[PDB]
Amino acid sequence: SMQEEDTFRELRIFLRNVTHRLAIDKRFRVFTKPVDPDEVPDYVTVIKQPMDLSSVISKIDLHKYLTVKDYLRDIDLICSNALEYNPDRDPGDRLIRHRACALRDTAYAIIKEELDEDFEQLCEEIQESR
Numbered sequence: 001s002m003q004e005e006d007t008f009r010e011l012r013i014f015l016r017n018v019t020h021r022l023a024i025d026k027r028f029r030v031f032t033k034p035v036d037p038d039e040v041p042d043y044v045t046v047i048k049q050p051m052d053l054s055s056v057i058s059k060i061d062l063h064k065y066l067t068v069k070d071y072l073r074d075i076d077l078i079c080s081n082a083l084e085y086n087p088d089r090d091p092g093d094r095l096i097r098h099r100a101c102a103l104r105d106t107a108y109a110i111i112k113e114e115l116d117e118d119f120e121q122l123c124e125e126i127q128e129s130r
C-alpha cells in the first residue's frame with residue numbers, strides 16, 4: 001500500500017545514513033569499493049561472493065533491502081569475506097581482520113542504538129506478507 005511504501009522508504013533513508021557513516025570512516029576504506037583484479041588477482045579464487053559498501057549503496061537504491069536483517073546479512077558478508085581472505089598471522093592480515101570486526105561491530109551498534117525494534121518488526125511483517 002501507500003503506508004507500506006512509506007515504511008520501506010524510511011528504511012532506505014535509514015540504511016543510506018548508516019552506510020555513509022561506515023563509508024567515511026578511515027578504518028573502513030578497504031571495504032568501500034570492489035576488489036580490483038589487477039591489484040589482487042587471487043581474490044576471486046578465495047571469495048565466491050564479493051561484497052563492499054559501494055555495492056550495498058547500489059542495492060539500497062535498487063530496493064533490494066526490505067528489512068534490516070537483509071542489510072545486516074551483507075554487512076556480515078563483508079566481514080566474513082575479509083576474515084576468510086586474511087587468515088594469516090601477517091600484520092597486514094591481522095589489521096584487515098581487526099577493521100572487518102570493527103566494521104561489523106559498528107554497524108550492529110548503530111542499528112541497536114538508533115533503529116526502533118517495532119519499525120524493524122513492521123518491515124518484517126510487510127515482507128512476510130509478500
Ligand SMILES: CC(=O)c1[nH]/c(=N/C(=O)[C@H]2CNCCN2CCC2CCC(F)(F)CC2)sc1-c1cncc(N)c1
Binds near residue numbers: 081
Ligand atoms: C577486500 C579484502 O579483504 C582485501 N584483503 C586484502 N588482503 C591483503 O592484501 C593482504 C594479503 N596478505 C598480506 C597482507 N595484505 C594486506 C596488506 C595491507 C593491509 C592494510 C590495508 F589498508 F588493508 C592495505 C593492505 S586486500 C583486499 C582488498 C584489495 N584490493 C581492494 C580492496 N578494496 C580490498
